[model samples]
Target chain A: MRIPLVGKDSIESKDIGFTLIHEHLRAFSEAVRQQWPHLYNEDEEFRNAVNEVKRAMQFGVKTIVDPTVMGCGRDIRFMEKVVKATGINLVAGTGIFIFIDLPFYFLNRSIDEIADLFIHDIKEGIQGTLNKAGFVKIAADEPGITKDVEKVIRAAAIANKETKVPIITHSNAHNNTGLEQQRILTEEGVDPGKILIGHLGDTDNIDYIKKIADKGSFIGLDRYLPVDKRNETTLRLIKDGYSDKIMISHDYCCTIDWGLSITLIFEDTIPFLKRNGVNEEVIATIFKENPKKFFS
Target chain B: MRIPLVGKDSIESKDIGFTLIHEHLRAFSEAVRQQWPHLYNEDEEFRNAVNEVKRAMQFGVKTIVDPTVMGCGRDIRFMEKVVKATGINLVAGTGIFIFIDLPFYFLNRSIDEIADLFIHDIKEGIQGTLNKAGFVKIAADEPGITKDVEKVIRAAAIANKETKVPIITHSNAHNNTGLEQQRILTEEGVDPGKILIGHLGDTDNIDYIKKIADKGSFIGLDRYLPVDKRNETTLRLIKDGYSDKIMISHDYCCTIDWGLSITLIFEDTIPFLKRNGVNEEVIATIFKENPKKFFS
Candidate 1:
């Protein structure tokens, strides 16, 4: 009875296309309705997101894994429109960030409650918004691995099992954080090979990157910069025998820098590999093949 | 003529037979002292240190770089006894540990004052108590460099300028601190090759080690343990094209665990490399050649 696992709901897999396994499309500026009413304009933001999606489709980045969990002001509505306009597969997400800032929200929520909500988002779709989510987005910070982040990581793994979605993480900047994330993920029964350890290019810590890669996790060098920083730690990691386990993208988003639109950031940053010493094949794998395999 | 410089003060050209770059002969244990004043009687501590030094000499350890900084309660008197007992050349040190709960005796002192004191120890021969203080030690924690550590590093560079004693550092458990230390030392016009960066084997951050080595600083992986802990980090770094830059030893102190003597930690840690598949000759170079050259 060696039947092949097929389709998203089957606990198997289907063709996921050229997947950008982890990314952010909504600009945090759009989460301004509560803090600043004057800045809460959505018409222009929606149109801009649509335009960005259209441009991304041109490059065949079919599935954009937007792991902007809800508490972080995740814009599921905008994700819906972007998916419609570009006809690209959008894998939305739900999970808390490292509770460093908003301690109040996470104070009472048990790990099971958080995991249930994450699972609910993927199951019934975002609360009343009707947009489906597909992955868990979580983050952690230094002192390597603290106890609080450990709870969130466990919840994400549980949610992934319940929802049949992959897990993507906002790894801490230092290399030790990456190793800690891998440790937590593997310990919690998540398949390390399927986990995308995001933000691999944040530091020049090559040894940590290699250790993470050695754990069979996807090395996400996802900071899309137009000009390569002189210390291109992410690119160097790839050159250092980790090409097979790497995924590259710009954690490119709008709203952070007011003037530069998401489309502009994408256009400006995507050619970084070619402009720098990296060849087109690496670009294809990072942008296309590896990510495709990751989500699928 | 940029011929590679050599000197009695240089570590590389020196014919150091077998050197223990990281070791502690005497450590302050007030609780132990108070608990059993009669047990830790002055003669017992002296005899224990003497026996440890003799064992080290038996294993061909001729030059011992004892980075017995202030907080460790480094006793130059005990060092004098150890040197006299074993006939081992003891390179004693002066500097600050990263963070220690010390009362404000020298805390308010300026860098120049500290440098002056270190120079006085070398000049006046360690408070008129013993042989020459061999090197200077300082430390830096994460969040990059700090002002206090930078001052001490600069002070060490100044002390080196004045008296030509080599510098050693207790960096964070990785190589970033090494590079940071080197940058500070280099900016102060100290020869890059004179500083020995401690604890490269503390973490798996080898690429940073390679970079530090490339900068001509000596790498000390003296804390040899099983592969489960620090060894993976140390071994991976060495395999990554930085063998020449690396040195090995047990960063064992005579007073880490009260249940077991520090000498036992040394005896257990020394065979760890061979058990984990590192060459004896490589261990020899790490213990002897590299350190000899580093502190020559």
Candidate 2:
């Protein structure tokens, strides 16, 4: 099985070694840019994005799955430029990112209509480029399944059914939004095994994490914040025999306007996990085998 | 010609009195929201949004055209709640907001496929609701009509051709992007009369504004940032007998998370225009007559 890379050809999912399942290259609001251009410098940001990917490559990170979709600034055209500059695999996502309100385009659209668009991205190509999307990325946060968020999840479920693409989520673990997401997607007839419940590291609720993993979905310990707590949780989950059902990423963006660095994961979090007894085998499963299996 | 409101029924274009041509209701990045929940407070922000509309109602602003589309955080489901509370005629837009990157869904789609989505919004209901979109909004910023931006402009043009819906733009006047927008839309066979060159107020160059206006498109003096400069330009455009080709708006939002207030236009800019020898007739033309005619 092959995974798609934006602005380049596809690579075998097995070749997507040292993968980060969730990350972003450039994320910012176009509304902000229109209102205040000084807030973002595209050219400089692009250079910084390239450098961030290159730095990750130094740490043997060969591929990064960028779930920056409609709501996130998923600019594959610029991303293609980055891919050309650095031969790292950057997978683009296709879905809506809604917390409070769905974008107006999706406001009146039916579940099937939204799903068709997502399917198009997976089977066809993304961002007017020839590169197909690797997976479906939907988000549900603190708003907790608002009408639009539900609509997005249902749409992603339908898209996943049609395209058989892995469905990943930006879920609010503190609120257990991932459980609700699983419920909706499962109700829509998606196989729970293909769903990745992201942002699980935000909370240390072992039972809650177990419940998600037990349901056959992968848990993403994807945030780099509170390194010690996240590391402890990962080790605990591994010891509890949920290691194969876990995926890890920093969720860092290379050129986000927020000044977040991807290096924090490479320089800090991974080392912390290793030093704290998360052995190389488990780390390999979280970073490599799990993603390959998910995509496969 | 009845203008559609999200929650309630449609109102006659003539009844949409003192309307702001381009505005937003809740514009934020979903990417930012997914990464940071603290940046948004839906309940508090919704209440403040209702109050903002109420305050604008006090100043006789009956309607606001929100062009918050795919890229911006456009939430009609939530806007419907605000409309029910404030009784303000909130017109929603149907199109993509492309600056540099097209949304991932549109990346591989043909122009016609993209146009079909826009046409569906204009003719069918938006977000599965009964409220139809009143216009097609597209953007062309510093990137100056990249492949994706051009595709968006063409799609908007095609939708305008099919639905007779007016086209509005988020354009960079400094780069004269509205000219490129006009060229593409015009080349795609949309009437210039059906287009509005937005964000023209950001620049003071009358020649640039004239170039767009001369092609039979309305020029949006829509920003309230530099009040005196925008006012001076508006007065000059009116004196130059381009009153019919001008529209005024603050481009303000109710809850944009940017700390921007709609009151700036009502409290400061409108009064400045009134006090600066710009008579009521031109203001009425900019505020009311032009929009009515365009929609009609």
Candidate 3:
């Protein structure tokens, strides 16, 4: 199977390595930048992103899937600059990022109406970019599965099914929203294997994490925090034979509102996983084999 | 009372004469322009708008209230240019325009959260423009006052009441959706006089139009069509002594996707109103005195 990269040539699924399934390049408000551009230094942000992606390159990270869409200001052209500069594989997503309230433009549109927009992004290109989206992104957060959010989930499923891409999400592990998202998408005729329930690392409840993993969907131990707890969760999942169903990432942005330690995952996460008797095979599975399998 | 003109000095409500209340300057797709600007000629559109405003000025049209806001792609800077070039008074508005579906950005926000944004536009400026909006614009259409649309009406009412600006709308006259709009705004505790139930000219049902007039809100014979019917509606409204509650406009645009004939309103409507026993006093009431009273 092949995957499209933003402003770059496609990469084979088997060749994709050390993939960060969820991450952000920039989260600045699109309208704010459009109206009062002087407030931001685009050249500087661009350089910073280039430098950080290079840093990730040296640390052996290859591809980064940026699921920042309409609500979060998805700018594939800006992302294209980074892809061009650093030569890293950056997979951009297509879908609105929402928890409850739909953006006013999408509020009245039917589910198929919204899904066609996503399908266009995958088949044609994203917001006029020359890159097709590699997957559909969605969220079910503190509000859980609201009526509005349910529509978005269903729409993402339609796009994923129609466009032949995987579905990744911003789910609330505390609420076990991944299960609910899975339930809805499954009912919409989406396969569980095609869905990646992200942010599962945000909580330490192994029971909730295991429940998500047990259902055959990819478990996203994205957005690391309090390293010890995350390390503990990662080890337990590996012990429970879920290394094949796992994906890992800092969900960190080199240029978020702002941040440090692009190397934290390398210097921090890898060493800890290695020291805790998590074998290299399992690490390679999470960092490589699983994403290839999911994409395949 | 004084009204703020976009990118120009304020004007006294009494000086607002021969006004076209509901008009569009540019109804171009904002995102389309932002992404693929080669498709639009900004300078040409600017020049076209400037020429149209000047034409209207020569025809004795003094001011125009552009109720173009979020959904319609209101650009204060663009409107500012027209004001600077032609020295015509262009009153800009603040609010979302929706028939049924709320924009996703607004779907989850509370009435107060959304109202604050509109309030900021009126007191501060629209989308980061230095020009404060002069009124709140909304609509209730064929679907009637839906739950999502109800929230928008309430938000507009709160903004109008707090900012002390009139509430003009894009309501459906065919469905008499104007009455439902007035009912909601009234329940929100907005004064009936501060609300202008627009598009009453779309349908020829004078009894329905009179019912809205009896409610004490201004009526809009905004969009023109099949000249005979619109003229009949205006004449009957004047004959019935309802001219004082009427506001007239072609709901036209010069830079709208594209159009000609800025003089149509003057060449056709004014002569029609005058020839059919509609006195200057009543015509002035519909064109000038009514808007002044509504603003006051």
Best by TM-score: 3
Q: Against the true two-chain complex, what DockQ does each candidate achieve?
A: 0.01, 0.05, 0.11
Per-residue alpha-carbon lDDT of candidate 2 for residues A1-296, written as tens digits (9 for 90 to 100): 47888767788877889888887888865443432233467898789889989998898888888888876666668888988999888888788776766544444558887777787778867645577888989888876888878888988988887877899999988897999998889999989888999999889898998999999899998877377888788878887889899988888876664425776777777787677777889878888999988888
Per-residue accuracy of model 3 over A172-272 as CA lDDT, tens digit each = 87895788998899888888888899999888888888887888899998886587888888888888888988888777765543114566768888789
Please list the C-alpha lDDT of all candidates, in the order they appear. 0.62, 0.80, 0.79
Error of 3 at A75 (Å): 1.8
Residues forming the 10-long window of minimal summed lDDT in candidate 3 chain B: B29-38
Each model's TM-score?
A: 0.45, 0.54, 0.72
Q: Which stretches of candidate 2 lie over 4 Å from their true place?
A: A258-260, B1-296
True contacts kept of 1: 0.00
lDDT of 1 at A149: 75
Cα RMSD (Å) per model? 21.6, 18.7, 5.9
Docking class of 1: incorrect
TM-score of chain B taken alone, every candidate = 0.79, 0.94, 0.95
Candidate 3 lDDT, tens digit per residue, B1-296?
A: 37988877778888898888888877654443443333467788788778878888998888888888765668888898888888888899887776766544443568887688788887877666678889998877777888878888989988987888999988888895799999889888988888888888888899999998898899888786477898898888888889888888878766654213566768898799889887789877787888888777
Task: Give the Å shift of residue B110 in candidate 3.
Answer: 5.1
Please give the lDDT score at residue A150 for candidate 3: 88
